[PDB]
Swiss-Prot record, chain C:
Keywords: Methylation, Ribonucleoprotein, Ribosomal protein, RNA-binding, rRNA-binding. Part of the 30S ribosomal subunit. Interacts with proteins uS7 and bS18. Cross-links to IF-3. In stalled ribosomes contacts ribosome rescue factor SmrB. SUPFAM superfamilies: Translational machinery components. One of its GO terms (molecular function) is structural constituent of ribosome. Signal peptide: none annotated. GO terms for cellular component: cytoplasm; cytosol; cytosolic small ribosomal subunit. Located on the platform of the 30S subunit, it bridges several disparate RNA helices of the 16S rRNA. Forms part of the Shine-Dalgarno cleft in the 70S ribosome. Has been predicted to contact the N-terminal domain of IF-3 based on footprint studies; exactly how IF-3 interacts with the 30S subunit is controversial. Belongs to the universal ribosomal protein uS11 family. This is Small ribosomal subunit protein uS11. GO terms for biological process: cytoplasmic translation; translation.
Length: 70, 66, 117, 151
RNA sequence: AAGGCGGCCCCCUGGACGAAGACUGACGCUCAGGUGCGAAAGCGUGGGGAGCAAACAGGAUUAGAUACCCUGGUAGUCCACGCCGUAAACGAUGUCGACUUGGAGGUUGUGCCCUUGAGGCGUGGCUUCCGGAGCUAACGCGUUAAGUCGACCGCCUGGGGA
RNA sequence: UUCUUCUAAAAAAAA
């Protein structure tokens, strides 16, 4: 994530652009993921659970879109 | 919204650096299929082409290795 | 002390401490300061304020080289990810380029086991 | 408390000078509801403070108070496993309350003959930037400075 | 087929699926005993050893701490050839075949209509979630059945002992 | 961040 400050540009917006670029490229998440060793069974179970949630929330939203609360 | 199925190209050519650069980030990483909308078969072919180019030093592995 | 106009700032921002090192464009270090060596220890030394004070100390400790321009190389995750960059800008340096240089293996060596806290 | 932030209650000002915070001072100084005795003590202390300062009693009281008012204080948070003394800025009403309380507690510890004399000596030293009240001020400031890393 | 398999290139090679036919003509399904494959740890011989890390040592926490946490660290993890043949070896659901409402996807062929752009209409293989009848002690399964049937095999008869 | 354990006897309604 290289960010070269352009002419007539504030430092704070440059820092914000660098932070945005970093979270886009995902370096913090990658290092925190590789901080400790994760067993293949654990990562498979985690990915499976993540997919279950990512599908359940969509279905839950679809059901909630029909009914009303008052 | 896959460009490769739109042009109906048989197989992705690894020497086509000009088109390949549009599917990589500034860090050199591969952009996910769910973002760029490419079909899975062409996504695999595209990945193979990008790796072949990296081996051939036509594309960077990372933005920092010098 | 041979005067140098422009330099590189390496920020080794770990979880437990942060190290700031100013150098020339060829990698020869001129001065350094750390949060752990800036009068902070334990819980205090892993905070952005301790990091900014460390950055100020390092910037003060390199005044005799007369550096004006500076490009930043940031490495590692920490609380002091950007506060040191702020303190360096506020110390009177013209930040030209900001780069993240955090090393990530391409599935290389096996990391240590997960802490059972 | 939990549900409602109560509305601030009114306090009538002192009879001799019409000041609000001086009336607050006599309220803080009073013990066992003897406001008359407390009023006599503060009036005598101010009357001798006027001589030692050469300025009016309100101005002398205020300049003495300003050297005792803090601007940051530590408050316990304990989000981590240990006590986290977080330095937080102090609002003006609480600043005045802390200053007056510190002055009163310092005067109650001095060894002079009368409370009026104790209060007068404490106010003069505070204006002169000395005493245990300003010592307490520097101590809390030093603590907030040492723990400034948490915010 | 299961265990399992993740950079790129080459050599040798197994299986699966699709569209049109042509061909042999029940040659089929299952299988006690038998044989082969079979994660990880472990064993033998010969190498290799960066990171990780049983045992072990030191430092903490604690009333104690032969542990959890920290710093090191040896077999092992890696390669070649044999041995061992065990797992929550799991879909806790043996294999093969036929029939029984549907919906939204993922992945991989293929036919037609003007591909009047990434469009529309079918028809196959694998696979995920929801659900009707029906079944089930319930939870749930629900054309990839735990529904309705047929062929064969293995297994169970109170808990502990085991 | 650490925070262990409480032996050994109960009674409950029947149109």
């Amino acid at each position: 994530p290289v960010i070269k400050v352009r002419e007539n540009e504030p430092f704070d917006v440059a820092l914000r652009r660098f932070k945005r670029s970093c979270e886009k490229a995902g370096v913090l998440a990658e290092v925190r993921r590789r901080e400790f060793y994760e067993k293949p069974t654990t990562e498979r179970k985690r990915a499976k659970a993540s997919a279950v949630k990512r599908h359940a929330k969509k279905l839950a939203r679809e059901n909630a879109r029909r009914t009303r609360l008052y | 919204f896959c460009r490769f199925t739109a042009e109906g190209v048989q197989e992705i050519d690894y020497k086509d650096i000009a088109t390949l650069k549009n599917y990589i980030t500034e860090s050199g990483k591969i952009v996910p299929s769910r973002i760029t909308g490419t079909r899975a078969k062409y996504q695999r072919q595209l990945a193979r082409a990008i790796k072949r180019a990296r081996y051939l030093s036509l594309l960077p592995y990372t933005d920092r290795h010098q | 002390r041979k005067q140098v106009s422009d330099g590189v700032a390496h920020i080794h921002a770990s979880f437990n401490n942060t190290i700031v090192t100013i150098t020339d464009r060829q990698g020869n270090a001129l001065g350094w300061a750390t949060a752990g060596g800036s009068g902070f220890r334990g819980s205090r030394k892993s905070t952005p304020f301790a990091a900014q004070v460390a950055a100020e100390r390092c910037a003060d400790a390199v005044k005799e080289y007369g550096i004006k321009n500076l490009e930043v190389m940031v490495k590692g995750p920490g609380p002091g990810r950007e506060s040191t960059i702020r303190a360096l800008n506020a110390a009177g340096f013209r930040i030209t380029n900001i780069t993240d240089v955090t090393p990530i293996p391409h599935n290389g060596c096996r990391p240590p086991k997960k802490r059972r806290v | 408390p939990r549900r409602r932030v109560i509305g601030q209650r009114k306090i009538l000002p002192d009879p001799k000078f019409g000041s609000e915070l001086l009336a607050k001072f006599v309220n803080i100084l009073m013990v066992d509801g003897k406001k008359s005795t407390a009023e006599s003590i503060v009036y005598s202390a101010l009357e001798t403070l006027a001589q030692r300062s050469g300025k009016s009693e309100l101005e002398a009281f205020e300049v003495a108070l300003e050297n005792v008012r803090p601007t940051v204080e530590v408050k316990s948070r304990r989000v981590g496993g240990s006590t986290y003394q977080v330095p937080v800025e102090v609002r003006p009403v609480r600043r005045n309350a802390l200053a007056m309380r510190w002055i009163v507690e310092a005067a109650r510890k001095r060894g002079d003959k009368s409370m009026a004399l104790r209060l007068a000596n404490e106010l003069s030293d505070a204006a002169e930037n000395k005493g245990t009240a300003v010592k307490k001020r520097e101590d809390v400031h030093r603590m907030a400075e040492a723990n400034k890393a948490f915010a």
